[PDB]
Design an enzyme around this catalytic site. Structure first.
Site, PDB file in Angstrom:
ATOM      1  N   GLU A  70      -1.874  33.714 -69.036  1.00 34.11           N
ATOM      2  CA  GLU A  70      -1.835  34.078 -70.445  1.00 34.11           C
ATOM      3  C   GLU A  70      -1.381  35.537 -70.566  1.00 34.11           C
ATOM      4  O   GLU A  70      -1.956  36.451 -69.955  1.00 34.11           O
ATOM      5  CB  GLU A  70      -3.200  33.832 -71.109  1.00 34.11           C
ATOM      6  CG  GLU A  70      -4.416  34.433 -70.347  1.00 34.11           C
ATOM      7  CD  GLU A  70      -5.124  33.416 -69.447  1.00 34.11           C
ATOM      8  OE1 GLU A  70      -4.472  32.554 -68.838  1.00 34.11           O
ATOM      9  OE2 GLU A  70      -6.378  33.578 -69.318  1.00 34.11           O
TER      10      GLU A  70
ATOM     11  N   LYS B 286     -14.688  29.115 -61.574  1.00 31.69           N
ATOM     12  CA  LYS B 286     -13.795  28.453 -60.628  1.00 31.69           C
ATOM     13  C   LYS B 286     -14.544  27.673 -59.545  1.00 31.69           C
ATOM     14  O   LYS B 286     -14.099  26.606 -59.110  1.00 31.69           O
ATOM     15  CB  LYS B 286     -12.823  29.483 -60.026  1.00 31.69           C
ATOM     16  CG  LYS B 286     -13.493  30.545 -59.142  1.00 31.69           C
ATOM     17  CD  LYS B 286     -12.496  31.649 -58.697  1.00 31.69           C
ATOM     18  CE  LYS B 286     -11.845  31.398 -57.316  1.00 31.69           C
ATOM     19  NZ  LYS B 286     -10.590  32.150 -57.154  1.00 31.69           N
TER      20      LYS B 286
ATOM     21  N   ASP C 275     -12.101  24.978 -67.565  1.00 30.74           N
ATOM     22  CA  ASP C 275     -11.726  26.376 -67.807  1.00 30.74           C
ATOM     23  C   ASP C 275     -12.935  27.298 -67.701  1.00 30.74           C
ATOM     24  O   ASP C 275     -13.075  28.287 -68.442  1.00 30.74           O
ATOM     25  CB  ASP C 275     -11.020  26.523 -69.175  1.00 30.74           C
ATOM     26  CG  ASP C 275     -10.271  27.804 -69.341  1.00 30.74           C
ATOM     27  OD1 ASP C 275      -9.914  28.454 -68.330  1.00 30.74           O
ATOM     28  OD2 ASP C 275     -10.048  28.203 -70.531  1.00 30.74           O
TER      29      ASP C 275
ATOM     30  N   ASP D 270      -7.338  24.557 -65.890  1.00 33.06           N
ATOM     31  CA  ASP D 270      -6.701  25.847 -66.008  1.00 33.06           C
ATOM     32  C   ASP D 270      -6.869  26.672 -64.751  1.00 33.06           C
ATOM     33  O   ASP D 270      -7.828  26.460 -63.991  1.00 33.06           O
ATOM     34  CB  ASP D 270      -7.237  26.634 -67.205  1.00 33.06           C
ATOM     35  CG  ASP D 270      -6.383  27.829 -67.614  1.00 33.06           C
ATOM     36  OD1 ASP D 270      -5.163  27.793 -67.357  1.00 33.06           O
ATOM     37  OD2 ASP D 270      -6.914  28.799 -68.232  1.00 33.06           O
ATOM     38  N   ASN D 271      -5.984  27.643 -64.552  1.00 33.63           N
ATOM     39  CA  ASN D 271      -6.219  28.714 -63.584  1.00 33.63           C
ATOM     40  C   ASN D 271      -6.264  28.231 -62.138  1.00 33.63           C
ATOM     41  O   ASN D 271      -6.953  28.832 -61.304  1.00 33.63           O
ATOM     42  CB  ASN D 271      -7.500  29.519 -63.884  1.00 33.63           C
ATOM     43  CG  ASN D 271      -7.504  30.104 -65.272  1.00 33.63           C
ATOM     44  OD1 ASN D 271      -8.392  29.780 -66.078  1.00 33.63           O
ATOM     45  ND2 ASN D 271      -6.486  30.907 -65.590  1.00 33.63           N
TER      46      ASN D 271
HETATM   47  O1  7JP Z   1     -12.945  33.640 -65.569  1.00 34.95           O
HETATM   48  C1  7JP Z   1     -12.133  32.972 -66.201  1.00 34.95           C
HETATM   49  C2  7JP Z   1     -10.736  33.340 -66.295  1.00 34.95           C
HETATM   50  C3  7JP Z   1     -10.196  34.492 -65.657  1.00 34.95           C
HETATM   51  C4  7JP Z   1      -8.847  34.794 -65.756  1.00 34.95           C
HETATM   52  C5  7JP Z   1      -8.307  35.993 -65.113  1.00 34.95           C
HETATM   53  C6  7JP Z   1      -7.049  36.001 -64.550  1.00 34.95           C
HETATM   54  C7  7JP Z   1      -6.482  37.114 -63.962  1.00 34.95           C
HETATM   55  C8  7JP Z   1      -7.294  38.259 -63.959  1.00 34.95           C
HETATM   56  F1  7JP Z   1      -6.787  39.363 -63.377  1.00 34.95           F
HETATM   57  C9  7JP Z   1      -8.566  38.281 -64.484  1.00 34.95           C
HETATM   58  C10 7JP Z   1      -9.085  37.139 -65.065  1.00 34.95           C
HETATM   59  C11 7JP Z   1      -7.992  33.948 -66.504  1.00 34.95           C
HETATM   60  C12 7JP Z   1      -8.504  32.801 -67.152  1.00 34.95           C
HETATM   61  O2  7JP Z   1      -7.710  31.972 -67.864  1.00 34.95           O
HETATM   62  C13 7JP Z   1      -9.867  32.492 -67.045  1.00 34.95           C
HETATM   63  N1  7JP Z   1     -10.333  31.333 -67.650  1.00 34.95           N
HETATM   64  C14 7JP Z   1     -11.605  31.086 -67.582  1.00 34.95           C
HETATM   65  N2  7JP Z   1     -12.554  31.841 -66.906  1.00 34.95           N
HETATM   66  C15 7JP Z   1     -13.954  31.442 -66.836  1.00 34.95           C
HETATM   67  C16 7JP Z   1     -14.776  32.322 -67.785  1.00 34.95           C
HETATM   68  C17 7JP Z   1     -16.301  32.212 -67.609  1.00 34.95           C
HETATM   69  C18 7JP Z   1     -16.790  30.777 -67.772  1.00 34.95           C
HETATM   70  C19 7JP Z   1     -18.373  30.705 -67.858  1.00 34.95           C
HETATM   71  N3  7JP Z   1     -18.702  29.421 -68.383  1.00 34.95           N
HETATM   72  C20 7JP Z   1     -18.308  28.934 -69.641  1.00 34.95           C
HETATM   73  C21 7JP Z   1     -18.879  27.660 -69.820  1.00 34.95           C
HETATM   74  C22 7JP Z   1     -19.657  27.339 -68.642  1.00 34.95           C
HETATM   75  C23 7JP Z   1     -20.486  26.310 -68.238  1.00 34.95           C
HETATM   76  N4  7JP Z   1     -21.100  26.337 -67.058  1.00 34.95           N
HETATM   77  C24 7JP Z   1     -20.912  27.397 -66.263  1.00 34.95           C
HETATM   78  C25 7JP Z   1     -20.148  28.524 -66.510  1.00 34.95           C
HETATM   79  C26 7JP Z   1     -19.505  28.474 -67.761  1.00 34.95           C
HETATM   80 CL    CL Z   2       1.078  33.267 -73.016  1.00 34.95          CL
HETATM   81 CL    CL Z   3      -9.261  29.522 -74.324  1.00 32.33          CL
HETATM   82 MG    MG Z   4      -8.546  30.035 -68.161  1.00 31.08          MG
END
Ligand code: 7JP
Ligand code: CL
Ligand code: CL
Ligand code: MG
Length: 213
Positions: free
Chosen positions: A197, A142, A139, A167-168
């Protein structure tokens, strides 16, 4: 303050201390009624719960914690003595996540690993005393889903039957990862269609069970 701080404060003020389910409900209420946030959410969370209960993993690695929603979701279903390690690159989010887990009463089951997955995965065996992983929840960024799966394998962290759950895979999407695992004889894959979500937008989870070299 930040959105993430607002979410934590809302949980502290609207959930019951030590009650993980109340913590999840508070997060999902806030994010539905006040401010969207990238938690896995209840739709995809219900699928995660079903997977966790099927496998009863002893050792779970999560890549990407955010505010701790998924960590609370998974950790509340772990058996006594089972553990979750969750990696979070953003230090402010690591701190929110730790506080969320503390509030939920799950801190003894979960460890936060601070840093980037490409730096922390190679340290799991020696610094965090890992042998192999039973389950991995992806998660995080990407573009890291595929390289980190390959790195997990290189580092000897996968075994026959390790469950990857991603996820995603539809939104934002992980095309290279999906193509790879679906095309590989080393994985047995299943797609769980769901919704982004908090939104009426299709998303999904991919389960990819490692089968060996
Ligand atoms: O960006 C998303 C995300 C975006 C949308 C999403 C959908 C639709 C939209 F319109 C906008 C966003 C929906 C989701 O469920 C999302 N889930 C996760 N993430 C990743 C977040 C940043 C992770 C950084 N990070 C954390 C530990 C780690 C270790 N190493 C490297 C990097 C690391
Ligand atoms: Cl939901
Ligand atoms: Cl979460
Ligand atoms: Mg996610």
């Amino acid at each position: 303050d930040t959105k993430e701080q607002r979410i934590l404060r809302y949980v502290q003020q609207n959930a019951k201390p030590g009650d993980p389910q109340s913590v999840l409900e508070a997060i999902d209420t806030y994010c539905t009624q006040k401010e969207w946030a990238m938690n896995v959410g209840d739709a995809k969370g219900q699928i995660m719960d079903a997977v966790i209960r099927e496998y009863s993993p002893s050792l779970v690695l999560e890549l990407g914690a955010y505010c701790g929603y998924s960590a609370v979701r998974m950790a509340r279903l772990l058996q006594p003595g089972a553990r979750l390690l969750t990696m979070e690159i953003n230090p402010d989010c690591a701190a929110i996540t730790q506080q969320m887990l503390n509030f939920a009463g799950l801190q003894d089951k979960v460890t936060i690993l601070n840093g980037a997955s490409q730096d922390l995965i190679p340290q799991l065996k020696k610094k965090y005393d890992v042998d192999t992983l039973d389950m991995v929840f992806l998660d995080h960024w990407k573009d890291r889903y595929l390289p980190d799966t390959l790195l997990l394998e290189k580092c000897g962290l996968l075994r026959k039957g390790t469950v990857l759950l991603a996820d995603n895979v539809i939104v934002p999407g992980t095309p290279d990862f999906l193509a790879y695992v679906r095309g590989s004889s080393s994985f047995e894959c299943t797609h769980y269609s769901s919704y982004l979500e908090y939104m009426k937008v299709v998303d999904g989870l991919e389960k990819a069970i490692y089968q060996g070299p």
